[PDB]
Amino acid sequence: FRTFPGIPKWRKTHLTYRIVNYTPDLPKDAVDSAVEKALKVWEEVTPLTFSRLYEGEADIMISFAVREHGDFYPFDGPGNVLAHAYAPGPGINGDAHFDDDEQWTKDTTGTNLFLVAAHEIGHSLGLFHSANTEALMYPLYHSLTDLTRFRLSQDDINGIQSLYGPPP
Numbered sequence: 309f310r311t312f313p314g315i316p317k318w319r320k321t322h323l324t325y326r327i328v329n330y331t332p333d334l335p336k337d338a339v340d341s342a343v344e345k346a347l348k349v350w351e352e353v354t355p356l357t358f359s360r361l362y363e364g365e366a367d368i369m370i371s372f373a374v375r376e377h378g379d380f381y382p383f384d385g386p387g388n389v390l391a392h393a394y395a396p397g398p399g400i401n402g403d404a405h406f407d408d409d410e411q412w413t414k415d416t417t418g419t420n421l422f423l424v425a426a427h428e429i430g431h432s433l434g435l436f437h438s439a440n441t442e443a444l445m446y447p448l449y450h451s452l453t454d455l456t457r458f459r460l461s462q463d464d465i466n467g468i469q470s471l472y473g474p475p476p
């Protein structure tokens with residue numbers, strides 16, 4: 309695994325998130341579920357906990373965007389860059405943006421929102437890209453397939469635990 313330079317990490321174990329808006333690709337319950345599952349994946353192996361805010365300022369602001377969307381890194385239309393997320397810190401840091409020129413799916417027929425969100429939340433928490441080819445943190449989107457038995461790599465486990473420790 310890898311962290312970001314100077315190892316930026318959250319300095320508190322309880323993090324808030326807010327889902328700022330919703331793709332037309334999917335029912336709202338399926339967006340909420342995928343994001344929840346993505347946070348749980350990391351919760352499970354650290355002493356991090358998350359709660360959802362519906363108003364005010366959250367640590368991890370999650371949004372769907374196309375092209376220019378208010379930072380310096382515009383999205384690129386269909387495929388290629390699917391999403392991007394900033395390392396821990398105040399303001400835009402921690403936040404995760406999802407390119408809505410993808411077709412976001414609950415399954416594997418378009419782009420799987422759960423898998424990409426798990427990977428992006430990894431960045432929100434302080435993990436950079438892994439050299440490991442089976443790691444969730446491996447850069448490249450590999451259509452699983454079959455997300456039935458998805459489990460974090462050890463490597464991802466080693467990375468995140470090296471930042472926040474194992475569950476208490």
Ligand SMILES: [Ca+2]
Pocket residue numbers: 366367368369397398399400401402403
């Ligand atoms: Ca933030």
Ligand SMILES: [Ca+2]
Pocket residue numbers: 383384385386387388389390407409410
């Ligand atoms: Ca794209």
Ligand SMILES: [Ca+2]
Pocket residue numbers: 331332333407408409410411412
């Ligand atoms: Ca879309």
Ligand SMILES: [Cl-]
Pocket residue numbers: 326364365366368369
């Ligand atoms: Cl927010």
Ligand SMILES: [Zn+2]
Pocket residue numbers: 373377379381392405
């Ligand atoms: Zn962005």
Ligand SMILES: [Zn+2]
Pocket residue numbers: 427431437445446447
């Ligand atoms: Zn990545």
